[PDB]
Amino acid sequence: HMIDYKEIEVEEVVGRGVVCKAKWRAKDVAIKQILSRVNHPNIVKLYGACLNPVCLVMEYAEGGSLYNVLHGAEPLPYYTAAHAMSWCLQCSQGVAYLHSMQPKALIHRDLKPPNLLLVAGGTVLKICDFGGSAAWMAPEVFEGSNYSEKCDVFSWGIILWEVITRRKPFDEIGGPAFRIMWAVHNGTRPPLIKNLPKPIESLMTRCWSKDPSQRPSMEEIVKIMTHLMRYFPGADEPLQYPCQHSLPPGEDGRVEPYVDFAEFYRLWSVDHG
Ligand SMILES: *CC(=O)Nc1ccccc1Oc1nc(Nc2ccc(N3CCN(C)CC3)cc2)ncc1Cl
Numbered sequence: 001h002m003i004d005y006k007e008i009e010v011e012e013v014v015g016r017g018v019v020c021k022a023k024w025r026a027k028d029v030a031i032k033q034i035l036s037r038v039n040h041p042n043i044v045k046l047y048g049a050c051l052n053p054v055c056l057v058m059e060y061a062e063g064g065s066l067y068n069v070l071h072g073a074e075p076l077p078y079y080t081a082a083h084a085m086s087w088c089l090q091c092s093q094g095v096a097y098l099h100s101m102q103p104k105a106l107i108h109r110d111l112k113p114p115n116l117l118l119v120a121g122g123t124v125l126k127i128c129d130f131g132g133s134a135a136w137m138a139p140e141v142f143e144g145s146n147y148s149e150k151c152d153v154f155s156w157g158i159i160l161w162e163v164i165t166r167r168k169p170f171d172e173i174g175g176p177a178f179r180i181m182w183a184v185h186n187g188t189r190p191p192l193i194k195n196l197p198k199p200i201e202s203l204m205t206r207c208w209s210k211d212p213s214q215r216p217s218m219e220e221i222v223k224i225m226t227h228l229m230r231y232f233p234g235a236d237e238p239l240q241y242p243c244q245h246s247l248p249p250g251e252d253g254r255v256e257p258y259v260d261f262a263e264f265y266r267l268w269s270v271d272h273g
Helices: 066-069 081-100 152-163 178-184 198-207 219-233 264-272
Strands: 006-013 018-024 028-033 046-051 054-061 116-119 123-129
Touching: 006 028, 028 116, 046 198, 066 116, 081 123, 081 219, 116 152, 152 219, 198 219, 219 264
Parallel strands: none
Antiparallel strands: 006 018, 018 028, 028 054, 046 054, 116 123
16 A cells, blocks of 8 residues: 555654654554565564655554563563464464565565564564674575575574573674674584473574575474474463563573473373373
8 A cells, every 4th residue: 555644643763764653544553764465464564655754654563572572671571481482483484474475485584583573462473574683694694605595494593592591692702793603604503401302402403504405494394383382382371470580600501491391391291101
């Protein structure tokens, strides 16, 4: 659609290259002043666009960004292993859809929690795109190599590590972006997670492979994640309990998960033994 700007009522700035919450036809909306075949539940919908000032009109995500949920200002919300696996399943479903786009695949290129928006009490995730991103970028990208949709698989793997640990990836490296690029180019990866279930560890590290052809397709991730949710009930629970979270010491190349996998091991055991 081609929206009339006067029909919109701007409100508070949301992000700042500036995004603001607004009403348009009694519908809450996000707008942004200085592709259309995309229709998926896990991708922020583009309603239309105005002409002067030229601006995008998109659905509004009331929950803010995943990054904000994970690492934002106190008070931070509690969340569970089911939430973590659900966010990543929903992210892979949105991204699989982009990769299936005809006649040419759409690669996100910038998959990272600051661009993953939440709604429905923090339970539904939606990919947003307008394109310190080094931390989620596949090495072939910033070495100027020819990349493919496998670069998004790499980013997803980092995100999976991130929601399970509630840690910023490569937070210990710091300095400018080039230090992380150098690190990851040389094979450094986020530390392994104590007690992580072997199937999730297998999936995560595969996604981190240096060789992009050794990473799984997104369609494979979606399917694997779909079937693992049988062991992660509770993803529909709205985020609503308070959390006081503090970084446990992290050395020995081994960090503790923030989420708890005891119930996964219990439900797995019922099925298998
Ligand atoms: C695609 C993208 O990067 N989107 C995006 C990033 C940052 C801000 C806004 C963006 O677009 C956007 N945002 C939203 N909803 C939303 C709601 C609240 C917030 N807050 C919550 C409190 N914080 C302190 C930070 C911001 C951020 C974003 N809906 C849709 C769209 Cl397109």
